[model samples]
Target chain A: SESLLYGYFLDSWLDGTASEEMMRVAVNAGDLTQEEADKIMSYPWGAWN
Target chain B: SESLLYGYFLDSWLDGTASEEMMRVAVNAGDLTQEEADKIMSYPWGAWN
Candidate 1:
């Protein structure tokens, strides 16, 4: 299978509609760290493509 | 009204998982421009949140 590198975080990236509060939930859910979230935010346009 | 500054682009942004193909669709959808997408991709973490 082709699991995403970002997991649930991928939905927010592809959809481009996530809120800060939603990310907080993910952090608390232990799905990701704030640092990872921040790095994801910083990547260039082609990083995912 | 509380319309988002980035519209649907906001979806891909906060979630941080959008694919180049998806943005291509958005570009073809006439909803956003390529340059705008690149900019969205480059904005710092707090730009939206």
Candidate 2:
């Protein structure tokens, strides 16, 4: 999940209080797999914080 | 078109390269209304570059 955040562009991504709506939108769109979205969301995603 | 890209999580968003696929999915999933999706995509979505 190191640079997985790099592929995205949202301050929230940097904060880890990530937006589920945005990520959900990504998974729903197939830009991200469910597993990927899960890993991200589970990271407390703010670890990058 | 301004922070709309901000509401999303892909560099694909920042670059305004946009995504017919992601936007389409938003519409399909009702995250974004069809009209909203059109407004989003119509910026040609690449103007941010």
Candidate 3:
């Protein structure tokens, strides 16, 4: 679950709790997943959606 | 599944059914779980979280 939280936003992506720099680095460094990515793209927002 | 009537929010949503479209969209979209949504449709809001 190290970066599991990222999976929820993997599809479209948001840097909500994370800083822009950290989120950018995480995405570029490959800390997130495909299913997580799919879900991210599924909604315009988070569970907050 | 009876306990499944939106699990609970049913009475509240519809109880207040002032016909807000945002509420409608919140409902029509697949964003809600059926059981929960149905209950929410009937809910009044303050009863549940």
Candidate 4:
């Protein structure tokens, strides 16, 4: 059930489509902190298989 | 759009309900590496506000 749910977030992450507002909500929702969210946004990317 | 999407995930996180299988899918989907997923699973929590 969670995998099916996170599928939505995964799609956003893979597409580089998350908005700043989305990150803030994640922080507020206790899903992630601002720091962690920023870190994820900053991670280096490469070709996906 | 992305915030609305991650809402689904935030609900799971707030409820303390994410499956290991979901995390694996996240890794495979290029949404997160195994490392990041592990880190999120290990974070300390007090309460959700």
Candidate 5:
């Protein structure tokens, strides 16, 4: 699970439509650490984990 | 969306054999859990979120 593996969890991984706010929810939920969230956002699509 | 995991969102997971129910409604009806659904088949083409 991304929560454990990458540290955050997404309600959904929208295809080319996910927003920064949604991504932040997963990042701030304690599912993942903030640093990990930055890493996830740094990548694009397939590059995203 | 199994219910939330549907749509072009999961296009990479299928070969267009997707059932109308499976795509539009099944994914969100809780008819199947994404992990369970993923287990029912292979995502050999790539990894699903």
Candidate 6:
């Protein structure tokens, strides 16, 4: 298993972690901007629709 | 539409890009390590069974 402390975005992709929290981790890690995270969070809706 | 160059990952989650290609993009973006990308590529298996 990967370490959640550093891999929270990885966790979100594999499991069901809420997008809001995933984005929070991503932003803190400097892997994403808030706008980019928002876009990522919206992707599921695009997939379904 | 979001820009594909920067949002290739966002594209994969929403569309049908192959895992190999998606991983390429993720790694290039520094969003994922190769090992982590491999694990993510396997997640549909976990989701199914």
Error of 5 at B12 (Å): 8.7
Q: Rate the local accuracy (lDDT) of all candidates.
A: 0.52, 0.54, 0.40, 0.48, 0.44, 0.47
Candidate 5 lDDT over residue span A3-28, tens digit each: 45442132233133456676777666
Clashes of each: 15, 2, 23, 0, 8, 0
Cα DockQ of the candidate 1 complex: 0.03
Model 4: colliding residue pairs: none
Candidate closest to the true structure, highest TM-score: 2
When only the first chain is scored, the TM-scores of the models are 0.52, 0.57, 0.35, 0.52, 0.51, 0.47
B1-49: candidate 5 lDDT, tens digit per residue: 2443334335534543343334233334343465655653554433432
Q: What TM value does model 3 have?
A: 0.30
Candidate 6: tens digits of C-alpha lDDT, residues A1-49:
2223333343354344555665787778877666556544543322222
Docking class of 2: incorrect
Model 3, span A21-44: residue lDDT tens: 544565666765544344344433
Using all chains and alpha carbons, the TM-scores for the candidates as numbered come to 0.34, 0.39, 0.30, 0.33, 0.33, 0.32
Model 1 C-alpha lDDT per residue in residues B1-49, reported as the tens digit of each score: 2123334564566445566666677778767777655655554333333
Clashing pairs in 5: A7-A31, A7-A32, B1-B4, B1-B5, B1-B27, B2-B27, B3-B27, B3-B28
For model 5, the stretches where C-alpha displacement exceeds 4 angstroms are A1-14, A46-49, B1-49
Give the least accurate 10-residue stretch of model 2 chain B, judged by summed lDDT: B1-10
Name the better of 3 and 5 by lDDT: 5
Q: List, for all models, the DockQ compared with the true complex.
A: 0.03, 0.08, 0.09, 0.04, 0.04, 0.10
Error at A22, model 2, angstroms: 0.6
Q: What is model 5's DockQ versus the real complex? A: 0.04
Name the 10 consecutive residues with the lowest summed lDDT in model 1 chain B: B1-10
1 versus 4: better lDDT goes to: 1
Query: Candidate 6: where are CA atoms >4 Å away?
Result: A1-18, A45-49, B1-49
Between candidates 2 and 5, name the one with more favorable lDDT: 2
DockQ, candidate 3, comes to 0.09
